[PDB]
Amino acid sequence: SKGEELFTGVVPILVELDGDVNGHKFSVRGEGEGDATNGKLTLKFICTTGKLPVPWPTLVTTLVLCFARYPDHMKQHDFFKSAMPEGYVQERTISFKDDGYYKTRAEVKFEGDTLVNRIELKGIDFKEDGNILGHKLEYNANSHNAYITADKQKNGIKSNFKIRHNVEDGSVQLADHYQQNTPIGDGPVLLPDNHYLSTQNALSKDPNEKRDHMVLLEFVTAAGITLGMD
Structure with missing residues (x-):
């Protein structure tokens, strides 16, 4: 595959999410750009339906791992770019400890010159007074490492990892992530050896934006x- 050649420069990004958590429906649209040479993503997300009924940090992992920086000695382990431009399906279950779970299905693929992440999210069995529907989480995101393993019996990768959301009261809300990716096209894809992705996040607000939103680096x-050796 020569999909990695599509990420040598800066690539525009479009993210579209339709969500339904305990019957609270919402939509999010994001736009920005990715710079895989530096492993850098910059986007601004808008809740186009008004008020987001879950905390913005709980959506970070859901809202494009093809922009990860793979070092030259690891280029052969980069499943995400190898599937491009046809893309891959990214499916997760995110189980919030002592609360509900998200189920997500996304298609990550090129549409013209833009890398598009189109997501359907359903949230189930949440507590209305809990940390999620109750908006009790801090507006930040800890740095984390998530291990990748190949899933040869599906021609893809899988990953399980924990996200620790900081609660306003000083506690931690565990978000247990179970992830599976599989390619869309039938071309050749790289099944990696065991490795991990190292992730940092900076969440901010646009001073001139009145809608409910998240600026994310x-x-x-x-x-x-x-x-x-060499």
């Missing part, structure tokens, strides 16, 4: 493969 860098 994210860095994702691949690691965990020994750069051994």
Whole structure:
């Protein structure tokens, strides 16, 4: 595959999410750009339906791992770019400890010159007074490492990892993520050796934006493969 050649520059990004959490429906649209050479993503997300009924941080992982920076000695382990431009399906279950779960299905693929992430999210069994529907989480996102393993029996990858949301009261809300990715096209894809993605996030607000929104800067860098002999 030569999909990685599509990410040598800066690439415009469009994100569209339709969500339904305990019957609270919402839509999010995001736009920005990705710079995989630096592992850098910059986007602004808008809740186009008005008030977002869940905290913005709970949506970060759902709202484009093809922009991770894979070091040269790990380029052969980059499943995400190898599937491009036909893309891959990214499906998760996000189980919030002592609360509800998200189920997400996304298609990540090129539409013209834009990398598009189109997501359907359903949230189920949440507590209306809980940390999620009750808007009790801090507006931030801890740095985290998430391990990738190949899933040869589906021609893809999988990953399980924990996200720790900071609660306003000083506690931590665990979001247990179970993830599976599989390609859309039938072309050749790289099934990686075991490794991890290292992620940092900076969440902010646009002073001139009156709608409910999130400005996000994210860095994702691949690691965990020994750069051994040569």
